[PDB]
Write a protein that holds these residues in place. Structure first.
Motif, PDB file in Angstrom:
ATOM      1  N   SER A 332       2.826  12.753 -41.633  1.00 30.68           N
ATOM      2  CA  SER A 332       4.182  12.222 -41.507  1.00 30.68           C
ATOM      3  C   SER A 332       4.951  12.248 -42.827  1.00 30.68           C
ATOM      4  CB  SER A 332       4.143  10.792 -40.970  1.00 30.68           C
ATOM      5  N   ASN A 333       6.275  12.310 -42.730  1.00 27.23           N
ATOM      6  CA  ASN A 333       7.128  12.199 -43.908  1.00 27.23           C
ATOM      7  C   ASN A 333       6.996  10.814 -44.534  1.00 27.23           C
ATOM      8  N   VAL A 334       7.161  10.745 -45.852  1.00 25.52           N
ATOM      9  CA  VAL A 334       6.942   9.515 -46.617  1.00 25.52           C
ATOM     10  C   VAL A 334       7.712   8.316 -46.069  1.00 25.52           C
ATOM     11  N   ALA A 335       8.993   8.518 -45.776  1.00 31.88           N
ATOM     12  CA  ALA A 335       9.859   7.441 -45.304  1.00 31.88           C
ATOM     13  C   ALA A 335       9.375   6.843 -43.980  1.00 31.88           C
ATOM     14  CB  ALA A 335      11.290   7.937 -45.161  1.00 31.88           C
ATOM     15  N   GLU A 336       8.698   7.658 -43.184  1.00 38.64           N
ATOM     16  CA  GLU A 336       8.137   7.206 -41.918  1.00 38.64           C
ATOM     17  C   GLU A 336       7.057   6.150 -42.121  1.00 38.64           C
ATOM     18  N   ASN A 502      30.464  -4.214 -48.783  1.00 40.11           N
ATOM     19  CA  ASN A 502      30.584  -2.897 -49.392  1.00 40.11           C
ATOM     20  C   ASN A 502      29.459  -2.013 -48.867  1.00 40.11           C
ATOM     21  N   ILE A 503      29.655  -0.702 -48.909  1.00 46.27           N
ATOM     22  CA  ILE A 503      28.647   0.233 -48.427  1.00 46.27           C
ATOM     23  C   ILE A 503      27.329   0.052 -49.178  1.00 46.27           C
ATOM     24  N   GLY A 504      26.255  -0.171 -48.428  1.00 51.25           N
ATOM     25  CA  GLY A 504      24.941  -0.378 -49.007  1.00 51.25           C
ATOM     26  C   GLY A 504      24.520  -1.835 -49.002  1.00 51.25           C
ATOM     27  N   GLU A 505      25.322  -2.676 -49.647  1.00 56.95           N
ATOM     28  CA  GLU A 505      25.038  -4.105 -49.753  1.00 56.95           C
ATOM     29  C   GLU A 505      25.062  -4.779 -48.383  1.00 56.95           C
TER      30      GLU A 505
ATOM     31  N   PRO C  50      21.950   4.058 -49.193  1.00 56.12           N
ATOM     32  CA  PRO C  50      22.730   2.864 -48.884  1.00 56.12           C
ATOM     33  C   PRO C  50      24.106   3.237 -48.355  1.00 56.12           C
ATOM     34  N   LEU C  51      24.746   4.195 -49.019  1.00 55.50           N
ATOM     35  CA  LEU C  51      26.028   4.698 -48.547  1.00 55.50           C
ATOM     36  C   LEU C  51      25.860   5.396 -47.201  1.00 55.50           C
ATOM     37  N   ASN C  54      25.837   2.870 -44.744  1.00 59.63           N
ATOM     38  CA  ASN C  54      27.209   2.465 -44.473  1.00 59.63           C
ATOM     39  C   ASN C  54      27.865   3.420 -43.479  1.00 59.63           C
ATOM     40  N   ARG C  75      10.931  15.315 -45.291  1.00 63.27           N
ATOM     41  CA  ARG C  75      10.213  14.925 -44.088  1.00 63.27           C
ATOM     42  C   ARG C  75      10.590  13.509 -43.677  1.00 63.27           C
ATOM     43  N   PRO C  76      10.886  12.672 -44.666  1.00 67.39           N
ATOM     44  CA  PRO C  76      11.284  11.294 -44.410  1.00 67.39           C
ATOM     45  C   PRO C  76      12.702  11.225 -43.867  1.00 67.39           C
ATOM     46  N   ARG C  77      13.596  12.020 -44.451  1.00 67.10           N
ATOM     47  CA  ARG C  77      14.963  12.102 -43.954  1.00 67.10           C
ATOM     48  C   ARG C  77      14.992  12.694 -42.547  1.00 67.10           C
ATOM     49  N   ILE C  79      12.548  12.258 -40.513  1.00 68.54           N
ATOM     50  CA  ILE C  79      12.038  11.154 -39.716  1.00 68.54           C
ATOM     51  C   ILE C  79      13.164  10.192 -39.369  1.00 68.54           C
TER      52      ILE C  79
END
Lengths: 1317, 42, 122
Positions: A332-336, A502-505, C50-51, C54, C75-77, C79
């Motif tokens: 799997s991809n890291v973010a997963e 704001n975007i992100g926060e 983060p953006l 948004n 791979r994570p993106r 995902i």
């Protein structure tokens, strides 16, 4: 009486002959006094104050006599010295021989089997002692012992697989590792064994801790000794981890031990009451074990580097997963897979054995042998793998989610907000200030948190007092039985805006609310509440009262239960509403109802909302029923926290030659001018030297060569080499016109060669630090530096920052006497005008406006003198046109004729005769008259240069825009307090405020973070700081910044200024060495504290310093004051220390002097305690009262409130008879010894202070004179040394004096009669 | 505790539904029901 | 605002210009979000995530996975593109290639259009 009698017999000071050393004294005192009293603090204090360590313990210590009792006693004394903030290591430095043996055996004792020879408390004492050692590596004697505990060889404590992993990770490490192993061969067997034991100490200490920690039960009763051991251990871990030299190799060791995972799964953290402090300390440790720094380079990690580290960990876990186990996870991809949730999903179902095996492949645990079961818990194994690999939020994101206001969950937590009752026996979850910081973020965050938590203490006092006064009672509603000045019942409260994030926060960008109060109060209070302004911070409070109506309140009892405290939230005033619904020529509102629109902390709002939505918690913001305001001058905490956070967010671009020194590591001298690459060879010293003789005398070690031989031609320029030779060039100030009064003002101070070194340094690029003892001319040095920079570097702007407005008044006073144009001066502030001219924005706008008028009138006069017609007045605009078209043209034609050649033609063709008729040529020589003509043109040009600068006032109508122009553009010297600088940094940066040079005064009175902030009142320039110079002038031997709650000083050293830290770090200082305000005799009482502090000539030679004080034999005396009516020191209220015997004596002396004809105003009365201050005042009014013959002293105040002040005669009361108290701080002593110009008379229990080792250099001098007041009541022109031509009577006590003064006065009432009405 | 008509020990003025606390001198002549039944409009 | 537009063109000519552009996008549009995503593709990673969060909150609709793909530079993106697909076609496969037929993907796109359901079945 036992410990004291022993002291007297064996070791006490000021006892000529003592019994010889006896080991049994140490054994008996430790077992029967220290251990048996359960390490009672008062016992340990008595021993420490009696100089047990210096006079008995250490100087008699040897390997042959060393015992448990001996080791422990030394550590108790050292620990107590730290608790009392007195020098802890001096006796070891004096006789260092047996310290290595002693230190090694402290190590053995610390590792001793739990509950064995040493009790757990005794080993806690050893933990704390070792903490002090690691925190004291600046001491060579300590460092030379600790080195072996924390260097690369300590890695032999690592698991073998982890060691190899690290050596593979950093291949260049292996050769150093090999070299260590080789050098180890050259060691004899015992030295090798000792080396290995030292290398393994910290890793073995961790194992001891882990087993102690595990012995804590989940719910069953636990001994406090186990809790406190664990607490002190984490404190040690934090300090080791927060200091780079101790962190560098130990961080890996700490990780290899998995201590942090053990701690978070422990029974102790799960105990909500017992383990609360342990938990908070644990959170601090976690912050540092994961701190964003490269251990080897010492550099902060970037966001990319962090991400790479995290990605590499997952990657290697997936490699192991794929090859040996988790197939889907591995692909799997890291973010997963890298969230805590995903990791639990993937590894949670696995068996203990499998998880152990996974960990082993990552070199985290030893291999699990085939068919064996792991001995570790599954929850340990899981948390080990999960915590190691899960996503982490950065330090910045963590900071940006912190509310800026304390809640009810913080304000009464004494682990982080200690009371003033904090003894120092337990530890606190607080940052510490010493010498070094890891990175700028570490540095800024420690100051952020200390400021945050210390300010919270004052908030609690404000809340407890005002809310108690309101007397909240049950009616299920609340009724208030009392009223408070600073707090009002809330009549209505409504959240009126929750803005999008704001975007992100994940928090709203802005939360606002309307709060209504009913000002049914006294008009004074109505006015104060209506006096609330934008940015004022108020607190919103919810009470659900517990008591029935009429129930008395007790302030001694727990506040929260007393009033039913439920919530505290902060807010910031936007403005009061008017009757048109507008946020506020201020209007006159009608009725008694007032509504304020306020800002709520958006992070706090989101957390509360999240808590409500997720967990069904009630909406906090529908419950407020009290609003409290504060004193504005004590209420800047939120704005300071905001500014610091903003500074942290920015790239914090400080000069690269400052960054390392600021963080406290690297060469402390690397910013000295002699080591700056851009050091300037040739400087114009202008009016610094009064003559060539003064100059030559200013550089003792140099050979001075003048570019001109004629002694009559000898301002000066000086060229410095790049070798002991200085090339001095005299030069002539350019003529400024035909009005000789327009010749410049000049310096009159004959600076010493040391003062010259300071001035020279301040003119050069880099860091200049000046230590200026009392009256050594700090201010004259400062303005000369400022003046020299002003003239040498006209483009450059200088920022002046002080602690007090008094110092600013002094600087501007002296600036006015120098050649500095007042249009280039500006003073910022949020004040009574004390200088001859007004340098505020208001005063400067007004000067410009008035000067513009006068100058435009000169242009009109010039126009007419030239025969140019036109009745219209000039503006700055048309004046500019006139200069180019009418003035420059005429001048250029003139120069074309006479400078491209007779004396006569200089005057004949001079185009401005008529304009200067009110004032030309001498007809002696061409060169002279030509320069006279040149000066006339400079005069005229200056008029138009100013008008061009003043054009802005024609383009900007409002005083605020006009002031902005002066601040951003016109001023070359801009001054403010460090307080103002902290409040206004945001506005200053937004304005585009720029400056090149910073000078500070009172630098050792300024908090660390408030010293740092003025470095960043501007934006970077092309990626670099514009700052060229940093000059700090102060005295670390005088009093430090004021910390309201001294617990933050005791534990955290929060009072320590940046100035003081830099001196400690080893930054070279220029130490001013000649004072000019007090008698040489008085100067002796404090000059021992400084490097070579002597006296200026006029102090040595002027009659006014050798003339005695009338009616008093000695110009200073220490006067012993025994008991009065069985009492010495008294305490009518807790901590309100007084001494009636001393007070009455002091007042009687003051009366004696007044009756002799002293100027009562020339006498000020000082004391070390506020309790005594009020009592002396009480006696002044009740004994002097309506007496015509007796005036009032200029001030009756405390020594701490008399900093930077002085009078001719000082009457000083030390008050204490039981314990020495805060005068033991030598800085308080030095200030107390230096407030008098001509006369100092001190009243104290002499024996008490004589016994204090730190006070000895002063009191050994004071007791060289009688301790009974010598008076000469029939007396002046008598000199200090000559035997008096009157009777000398000796007053042996206060009652005898009060008698004498009564009789003297009753004789003066009969023989005289004065008349004020 | 209640402080409203809705909701001797209380030691409060409480008037529970509608017993008048201020003078009115109202004209109305009391409506009546007799035994089981009827508003006595007669 | 025209000066802000010309200054935006100056930022387009370009770090400070990237600041002006990111400020121009954060000023508070999906095409503009695509432009800021292009800025993430050029300038510069978690802040971009983060953006992107948004932009995701602004509109949970199919190029968002590509916006996540910038974080992979994958791979994570991809995902995130898959989880977004679960939250809703080929984009997840592109994420798979990033971890490493268009016509059928196009009939699938016809399925992706917002008897008709029977066509979605066919």
């Amino acid at each position: 009486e036992f410990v004291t009698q022993l002291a007297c017999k064996y070791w006490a000071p000021h006892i000529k002959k003592k019994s010889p050393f006896d080991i049994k004294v140490i054994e008996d005192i430790y077992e029967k006094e220290i251990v048996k009293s359960r390490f009672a603090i008062r016992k340990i204090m008595l021993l420490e104050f009696s100089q047990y360590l210096e006079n008995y313990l250490w100087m008699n210590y040897s390997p042959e006599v060393s015992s448990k009792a001996y080791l422990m006693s030394i550590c108790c004394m050292v620990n107590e010295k730290f608790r009392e903030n007195v020098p802890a290591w001096e006796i070891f430095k004096k006789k260092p021989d047996h310290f290595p043996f002693f230190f090694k055996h402290i190590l053995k004792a610390a590792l001793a089997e739990t509950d064995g020879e040493f009790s757990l408390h005794e080993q806690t004492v050893l933990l704390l002692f070792l903490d002090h050692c690691f925190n004291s590596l600046e001491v060579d004697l300590i460092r030379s012992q600790v080195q072996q505990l924390i260097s690369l060889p300590m890695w032999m404590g690592l698991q073998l697989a982890r060691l190899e992993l690290e050596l593979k990770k950093t291949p260049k490490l292996r050769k150093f590792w090999n070299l260590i192993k080789k050098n180890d061969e050259k060691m004899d067997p015992e030295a090798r064994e000792q080396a290995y034991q030292e290398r393994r100490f910290l890793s073995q200490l961790i194992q001891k801790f882990i087993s102690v920690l595990k012995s804590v039960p989940l719910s069953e009763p636990v001994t406090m000794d186990k809790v406190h051991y664990c607490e002190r251990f984490i404190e040690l871990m934090i300090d080791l981890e927060a200091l780079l030299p101790t962190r560098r190799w130990f961080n890996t060791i700490l990780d290899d031990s998995h201590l942090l995972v053990h701690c978070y799964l422990s029974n102790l953290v799960r105990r909500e009451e017992d383990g609360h402090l342990f938990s908070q300390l644990l959170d601090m440790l976690k912050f540092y074990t994961g701190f964003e720094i490269n251990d080897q380079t010492g550099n902060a990690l970037t966001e990319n580097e962090m991400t790479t580290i995290h990605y590499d960990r997952i990657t290697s876990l997936q490699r192991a997963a794929f090859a040996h186990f988790l197939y889907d996870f591995a692909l799997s991809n890291v973010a997963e897979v890298d969230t805590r949730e995903s990791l639990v999903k993937f590894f949670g179902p696995l068996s203990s054995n499998t998880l152990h095996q996974v960990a082993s492949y990552l070199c985290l645990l030893p291999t699990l042998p085939k068919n064996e079961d792991t001995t570790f818990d599954k929850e340990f194994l899981l948390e080990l793998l999960v915590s190691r690999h899960e996503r982490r939020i950065s330090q910045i994101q963590q900071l940006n989610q912190m509310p800026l206001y304390p809640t009810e969950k913080i304000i009464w937590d004494e682990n982080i907000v200690p009371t003033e009752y904090y003894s120092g026996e337990g530890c606190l979850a607080l940052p510490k200030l010493n010498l070094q910081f890891l990175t700028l973020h570490d540095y800024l965050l420690r100051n952020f948190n200390l400021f945050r938590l210390e300010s919270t203490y004052e908030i609690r006092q404000d809340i407890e007092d005002s809310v108690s006064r309101m007397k909240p009672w049950q009616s299920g509603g609340v009724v208030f039985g009392g009223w408070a000045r600073m707090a009002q019942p809330i009549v209505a409260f409504t959240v009126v805006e929750v803005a999008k994030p704001n975007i992100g926060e994940n928090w709203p960008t802005r939360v606002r609310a309307d709060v209504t109060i009913n000002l049914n109060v006294r008009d004074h209070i109505k006015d104060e509440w209506e006096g609330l302004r934008k940015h004022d911070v108020c607190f919103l409070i919810t009470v659900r009262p517990t008591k029935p109506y009429g129930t008395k309140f007790d302030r001694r009892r727990p506040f929260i239960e007393q009033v039913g405290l439920v919530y505290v939230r902060g807010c910031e005033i936007q403005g009061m509403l008017d009757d048109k619904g507008r946020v506020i020529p201020r209007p006159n509102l009608r009725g008694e109802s007032r509504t304020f629109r306020v800002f709520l902390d958006p992070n706090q709002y989101q957390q509360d909302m999240t808590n409500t939505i997720q967990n069904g918690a009630e909406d906090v913001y529908e419950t407020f029923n009290i609003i409290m305001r504060r004193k504005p001058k004590e209420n800047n905490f939120k704005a300071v926290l905001e500014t610091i956070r903003n500074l942290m967010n920015t790239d914090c671009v400080v000069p690269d030659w400052l960054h390392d020194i600021i963080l406290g590591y690297g060469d402390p001298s690397s910013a000295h001018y002699s080591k700056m690459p851009n050091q300037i060879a040739t400087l114009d010293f202008n009016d610094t030297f009064l003559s060539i003789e003064h100059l030559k005398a200013s550089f003792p070690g140099h050979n001075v060569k003048v570019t001109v031989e004629d002694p009559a031609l000898q301002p000066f320029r000086i060229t410095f080499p790049v070798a002991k030779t200085l090339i001095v060039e005299p030069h002539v100030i350019p003529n400024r016109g035909p009005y000789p009064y327009n010749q410049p003002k000049r310096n009159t101070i004959q600076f010493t060669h040391t003062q010259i070194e300071a001035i020279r340094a301040g003119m050069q690029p880099g860091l200049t630090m000046v230590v200026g003892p009392p009256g050594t001319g700090k201010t004259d040095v400062a303005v000369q530096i400022i003046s020299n920079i002003y003239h040498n570097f006209p483009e450059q702007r200088t920022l002046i920052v002080t602690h007090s407005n008094q110092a600013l008044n002094q600087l501007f006073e002296k600036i006015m006497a120098l050649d500095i144009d007042e249009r280039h001066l500006l003073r910022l502030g949020h004040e009574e005008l004390e200088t001859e001219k007004d340098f505020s924005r208001y005063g400067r706008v007004n000067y410009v406006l008035a000067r513009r008028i006068e100058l435009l009138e000169e242009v009109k006069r010039l126009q007419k003198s030239l025969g140019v017609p036109g009745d219209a007045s000039y503006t700055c605009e048309t004046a500019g046109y006139f200069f180019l078209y009418q003035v420059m043209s005429r001048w250029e034609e003139y120069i074309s004729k006479v400078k491209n050649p007779d004396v006569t033609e200089v005057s004949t063709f001079f185009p401005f005769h008529e304009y200067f008729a009110n004032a030309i040529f001498k007809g002696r020589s061409y060169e002279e008259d030509m320069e006279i003509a040149e000066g006339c043109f400079r005069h005229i040009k200056k008029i138009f240069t100013q008008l061009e600068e003043f054009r802005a006032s024609e383009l900007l109508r409002s005083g605020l825009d006009r002031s902005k122009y002066l601040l951003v553009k016109e001023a070359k010297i801009i001054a403010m307090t460090c307080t103002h600088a902290a409040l206004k940094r945001h506005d200053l940066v937004k304005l585009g405020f720029k400056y090149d040079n910073i000078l500070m005064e009172e630098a050792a009175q300024i908090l660390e973070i408030e010293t740092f902030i003025p470095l960043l009142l501007q934006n970077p320039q092309d990626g670099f700081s514009r700052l060229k110079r940093w000059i700090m002038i102060g005295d670390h031997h005088q009093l430090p910044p004021v910390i309201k709650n001294m617990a933050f000083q005791k534990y955290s050293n929060m009072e320590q200024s940046l100035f003081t830290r830099f001196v400690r770090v080893g930054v070279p200082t220029v130490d001013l060495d000649a004072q000019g305000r007090a008698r040489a005799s008085l100067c002796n009482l404090y000059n021992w504290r400084y490097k070579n502090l002597g006296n200026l000539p006029h102090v040595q030679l002027l009659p006014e310093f050798s003339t005695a004080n009338a009616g008093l034999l000695y110009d200073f005396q220490l006067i012993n004051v025994e008991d009065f009516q069985g009492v010495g020191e008294s305490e009518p209220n807790p901590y309100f220390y007084q001494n009636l015997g001393e007070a009455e004596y002091v007042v009687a002396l003051f009366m004696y002097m007044c009756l002799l004809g002293y100027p009562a105003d020339k006498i000020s009365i000082l004391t070390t305690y506020n309790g005594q201050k009020h009592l002396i005042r009480d006696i002044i009014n009740r004994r002097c009262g309506n007496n015509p013959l007796i005036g009032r002293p200029n001030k009756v105040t405390t020594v701490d409130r008399f900093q930077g002040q002085q009078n001719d005669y000082i009457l000083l009361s030390l008050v204490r008879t039981r314990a020495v108290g805060h005068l033991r701080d030598v800085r308080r002593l030095v200030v107390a010894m230096s407030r008098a110009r001509l006369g100092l008379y001190i009243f104290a229990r002499v024996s008490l202070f004589q016994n204090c080792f730190e006070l000895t250099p002063a009191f050994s001098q004071l007791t060289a004179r009688p301790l009974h007041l010598h008076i000469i009541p029939t007396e002046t022109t008598r000199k200090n040394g000559e035997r008096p031509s009157h009777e000398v009577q000796i007053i042996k006590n206060m009652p005898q004096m009060a008698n004498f003064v009564y009789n003297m006065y009753m004789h003066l009432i009969q023989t005289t009669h004065h008349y004020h009405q | 505790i209640p402080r409203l008509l809705e909701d001797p020990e209380i030691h409060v003025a409480q008037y529970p539904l509608d017993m008048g606390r201020k003078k009115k001198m109202s004209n109305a002549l009391a409506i009546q029901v007799d035994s089981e039944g009827k508003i006595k409009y007669d | 605002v025209m000066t802000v537009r010309d200054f935006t063109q100056v930022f387009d000519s370009y770090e400070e210009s990237m600041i002006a552009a990111k400020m121009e996008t954060a000023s508070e549009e999906e095409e503009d979000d695509v432009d800021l995503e292009l800025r993430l593709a050029r300038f510069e990673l978690i802040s971009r995530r983060p953006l992107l969060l948004n932009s995701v909150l602004l509109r949970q609709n199919h190029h968002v996975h590509e916006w996540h793909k910038r974080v992979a530079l994958g791979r994570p993106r991809e995902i995130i593109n898959t989880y977004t697909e679960a939250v809703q076609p080929f984009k997840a496969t592109g994420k798979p290639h990033t971890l490493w037929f268009y016509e059928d993907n196009g009939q699938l796109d016809d399925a992706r259009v917002i008897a008709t359901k029977v066509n979605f079945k066919q």
